Design an enzyme around this catalytic site. Structure first.
Site, short mmCIF file in Angstrom:
data_model
loop_
_atom_site.label_atom_id
_atom_site.label_comp_id
_atom_site.label_asym_id
_atom_site.label_seq_id
_atom_site.Cartn_x
_atom_site.Cartn_y
_atom_site.Cartn_z
N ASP A 209 0.83 -1.23 0.00
CA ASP A 209 0.00 0.00 0.00
C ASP A 209 0.87 1.29 0.00
O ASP A 209 0.51 2.26 -0.66
CB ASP A 209 -1.00 0.03 1.21
CG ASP A 209 -2.04 -1.08 1.14
OD1 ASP A 209 -2.44 -1.54 0.05
OD2 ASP A 209 -2.46 -1.50 2.24
N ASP A 215 12.66 1.75 5.32
CA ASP A 215 12.82 1.44 6.80
C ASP A 215 12.05 0.20 7.27
O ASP A 215 12.09 -0.18 8.47
CB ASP A 215 12.44 2.68 7.74
CG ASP A 215 11.03 3.08 7.48
OD1 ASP A 215 10.45 2.26 6.65
OD2 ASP A 215 10.53 4.12 8.07
N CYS A 355 8.42 4.81 11.59
CA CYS A 355 7.30 5.27 10.82
C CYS A 355 6.61 6.55 11.40
O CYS A 355 6.26 7.51 10.67
CB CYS A 355 6.29 4.09 10.94
SG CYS A 355 6.00 3.60 12.78
#
Ligand SMILES: [Mg+2]
Length: 365
Positions: A209, A215, A355
């Site tokens: 997605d 990372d 994130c």
């Protein structure tokens, strides 16, 4: 349109010193089950864990500001900022430093919610477009704007000349389709101060997605030494991606002339969306589907580096959770490893801990 290279700035590694760490605050019901309360709890634990090591700045939308201020200890700075989601690694400014107007700057890349109108994660990212400038404008730090799409989660560095990236994301038609690899590459040499590149073919299995940002695939653990998402189960779709990247990295030489040493960091057992978690998502027609049984994109390489701190995920596979901590401790002997329980709660929306963070490097003198 002056570049950072013309002013002496470049991007330093995650291990270098930091002023504080930035984190956003989850809210949207179509991505955070149960009115986001479970993830708010995990974000709040992430921000408290990082504050043990260094100052945290959390930012929450106007509606959420009082909730975030009540949940978080007063030692965590809470600032008002409207956003469309809470992944500040990707909408946050990528900070850059100069060695000799301040000694710290930050780049504000263009953004399109990980591909845009037809392949992005949500349909409205207008507030996300100002979070870059709002942060640097609140810190009084100069802003270099880029019109190219780029997320901080899609770019890593060793602080010594080697930018690590992914073809899947950077060379994707949903990103900068009219740019070749040398154009994009030339911009990254100019804006991140780098000289060389290591292109891994794809991102982590289940990160389709967001187009597979690096990372969740691989990062540097220090110069010349990267951690790599790994499995030995040859039936898992991730195994061929791990062995592929291992081939690439083991023939890679960095910008300073070193042979890359890859340490394998084993993913947890396969994790899957449940009906209890999917049914908590409110379907509104503005964000992509979140369905039970889903292969959540889950890897321990998606941790954060704070001043002598390592903020790592815990996904609930007790065997793989304990083996990631052993692996990480053996790797940052000068930092203290800390785990975040219920890591799986920010991963249901496709991300985790790195994130959700934006390091601000300490300013040189
Ligand atoms: Mg931006």
């Amino acid at each position: 349109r002056e570049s950072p290279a013309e002013h002496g700035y470049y991007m330093p590694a995650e291990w270098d010193s930091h002023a504080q760490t930035w984190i956003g605050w989850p809210e949207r019901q179509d991505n955070w089950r149960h009115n986001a309360l479970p993830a708010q709890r995990v974000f709040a634990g992430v921000a408290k864990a990082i504050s043990k090591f260094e100052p945290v700045t959390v930012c929450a939308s106007p509606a959420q500001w009082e909730n975030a201020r009540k949940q978080l200890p007063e030692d965590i700075r809470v600032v008002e900022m409207s956003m469309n989601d809470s992944w500040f690694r990707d909408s946050g400014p990528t900070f850059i430093v100069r060695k000799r107007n301040r000694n710290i700057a930050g780049i504000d890349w263009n953004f399109n919610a990980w591909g845009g109108a037809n392949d992005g994660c949500y349909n409205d990212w207008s507030h996300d477009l100002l979070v870059s400038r709002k942060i640097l404008a609140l810190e009084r730090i100069p802003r270099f704007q880029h019109s190219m799409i780029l997320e901080g989660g899609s770019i890593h560095v060793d602080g010594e000349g080697t930018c690590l990236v992914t073809e899947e994301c950077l060379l994707n038609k949903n990103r900068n389709p009219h740019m070749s690899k040398e154009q994009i590459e030339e911009e990254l040499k100019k804006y991140l101060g780098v000289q060389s590149f290591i292109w891994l073919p794809r991102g982590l299995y289940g990160d389709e997605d967001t187009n597979g940002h690096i990372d969740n695939m691989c990062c540097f653990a220090r110069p010349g030494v990267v951690l790599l998402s790994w499995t030995d189960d040859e039936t898992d779709p991730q195994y061929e991606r791990s062995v592929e990247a291992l081939s690439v990295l083991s023939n890679s030489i960095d910008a300073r002339g070193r042979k890359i040493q890859v340490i394998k960091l084993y993913i947890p057992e396969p994790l899957y969306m449940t009906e209890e978690e999917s049914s908590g998502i409110t379907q509104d027609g503005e964000a992509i589907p979140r369905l039970a049984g889903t292969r959540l994109a889950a890897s321990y390489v998606n941790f954060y580096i704070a001043n002598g701190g390592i903020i790592a995920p815990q996904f609930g596979d007790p065997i793989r959770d304990k083996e990631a901590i052993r692996v990480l401790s053996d790797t940052f002997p000068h930092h203290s490893v800390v785990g975040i329980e219920n890591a799986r709660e920010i991963v249901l929306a496709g991300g985790n801990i790195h994130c959700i963070t934006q390091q601000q490097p300490a300013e040189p003198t």
